[PDB]
Design a protein around this motif. Sequence first.
Motif, mmCIF file in Angstrom:
data_model
loop_
_atom_site.group_PDB
_atom_site.id
_atom_site.type_symbol
_atom_site.label_atom_id
_atom_site.label_comp_id
_atom_site.label_asym_id
_atom_site.label_seq_id
_atom_site.Cartn_x
_atom_site.Cartn_y
_atom_site.Cartn_z
ATOM 1 N N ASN A 9 0.645 -1.670 -0.242
ATOM 2 C CA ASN A 9 -0.364 0.317 -0.014
ATOM 3 C C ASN A 9 0.592 1.238 0.119
ATOM 4 N N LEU A 10 0.792 2.469 -0.515
ATOM 5 C CA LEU A 10 1.204 3.261 -0.948
ATOM 6 C C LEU A 10 0.405 4.794 0.301
ATOM 7 N N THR A 11 1.055 5.907 0.517
ATOM 8 C CA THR A 11 0.449 6.430 1.569
ATOM 9 C C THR A 11 -0.765 6.910 1.184
ATOM 10 N N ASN A 12 -1.209 7.501 0.246
ATOM 11 C CA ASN A 12 -2.740 7.118 -0.475
ATOM 12 C C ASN A 12 -2.826 6.175 -1.496
ATOM 13 N N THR A 15 -3.511 6.339 -6.387
ATOM 14 C CA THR A 15 -2.595 7.738 -6.441
ATOM 15 C C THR A 15 -1.721 7.169 -8.311
ATOM 16 N N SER A 39 7.182 8.704 -5.203
ATOM 17 C CA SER A 39 7.586 7.717 -4.158
ATOM 18 C C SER A 39 8.740 6.904 -4.419
ATOM 19 N N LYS A 46 9.198 1.967 4.712
ATOM 20 C CA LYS A 46 8.830 3.464 4.756
ATOM 21 C C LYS A 46 8.686 4.262 3.706
ATOM 22 N N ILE A 47 7.466 5.101 3.699
ATOM 23 C CA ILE A 47 7.465 5.825 2.285
ATOM 24 C C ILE A 47 7.624 7.103 2.172
ATOM 25 N N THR A 48 8.729 7.955 1.521
ATOM 26 C CA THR A 48 9.185 9.336 1.406
ATOM 27 C C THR A 48 8.319 9.739 -0.112
ATOM 28 N N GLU A 49 7.567 11.102 0.242
ATOM 29 C CA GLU A 49 6.533 11.440 -1.215
ATOM 30 C C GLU A 49 7.713 12.530 -1.496
#
Length: 298
Positions: A9-12, A15, A39, A46-49
Motif C-alpha cells: 500500500n502506498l501512502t494514499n 494514486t 515515492s 517506510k514511504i517518502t513522497e
Amino acid sequence: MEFKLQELNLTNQDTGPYGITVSDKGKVWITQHKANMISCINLDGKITEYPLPTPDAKVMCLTISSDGEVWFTENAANKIGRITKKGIIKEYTLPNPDSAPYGITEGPNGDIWFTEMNGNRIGRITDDGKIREYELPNKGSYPSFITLGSDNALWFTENQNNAIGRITESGDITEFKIPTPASGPVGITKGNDDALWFVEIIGNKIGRITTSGEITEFKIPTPNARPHAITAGAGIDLWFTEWGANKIGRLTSNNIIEEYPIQIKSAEPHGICFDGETIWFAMECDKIGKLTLIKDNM
Ligand SMILES: [Cl-]
C-alpha cells in the motif's frame, strides 16, 4: 519456480502508480500519475513522497542515474524532472510545445536520454540542464520506451512505426522494422544475453533484437494480453507485464513463457523492475506488487 505475491500500500489510494525502478541498494522508486508525485519505499517499508512542483504533469517514467539522482518525464506538462540527492526537484521545460516526453534512461557517457512521443524526437539533457534533440526520420513514429544497449547505443520502440530504433551518442539513427505487421512495440530493455528485448502490445509477442538488428519473436500464451513493460530477471529470464490480462509473464529457459495471475480486479500492471531477488511492479489499481520465486529442490 512457483511463487509468492505480496501487495503493498502506498501512502494514499488511487494514486496511479505507473513507472518503477530500484536503486542498487534496494530502494524502490515509483511515479504516481494521478497523485502527481514520486515515492520512494526504503528497505524498512517506510514511504517518502516527492510531490511534483508542476500540477497535472502526468508523470510517466523514471530512472536512477549513476550519481543516484532520480530523473523523470512529465508527459502532459512538457518537462523533464530531476530529484537531487538533497531531495530538491528541478524541472526543465522542453523547447517545443506538446512534445509529450515518455521513456527515460542514462546514456553511455552519463547524459540523460528520453523519448518525446508526440514530438517525434529523441532528447538528451546534460548535468547542467542543456537540452539537445534529434528529429526522427518518419513522421508520427511515437517513440515510447528507451534503454541503453550493450553496444553503448540507446535503443527505443517506435510504437506507431512498427520499428525498433537505435541512436548513438553521435546521432546516428537506424530503424529495424518488426516482422509482425503493425505490432505496436512498447517496453524495451537490455537482456542479460546482450540483446534488446521488447513487447508488442498488438502483435502479442515478446521480441528479441540483437545489437546487429536481428529479430526473433515469441508468442505470448494469453491472447489479448496487451503487454506493456519488460525487464531482465536472473540470467536469461525476461519479466513482463500483461496490462490487459492482469498477469506477470516470464520468458525463461528454452524460451518457454510462464504466466502468473495477479489476484486483483483490474490490477492493470504497468512498470516492472527486478532487484536481484524480487520482481516489483506497479499496478494502476493502486498497489505495488512484489513477486518472488521459490527455489527448486533435489
Ligand atoms: Cl550520454
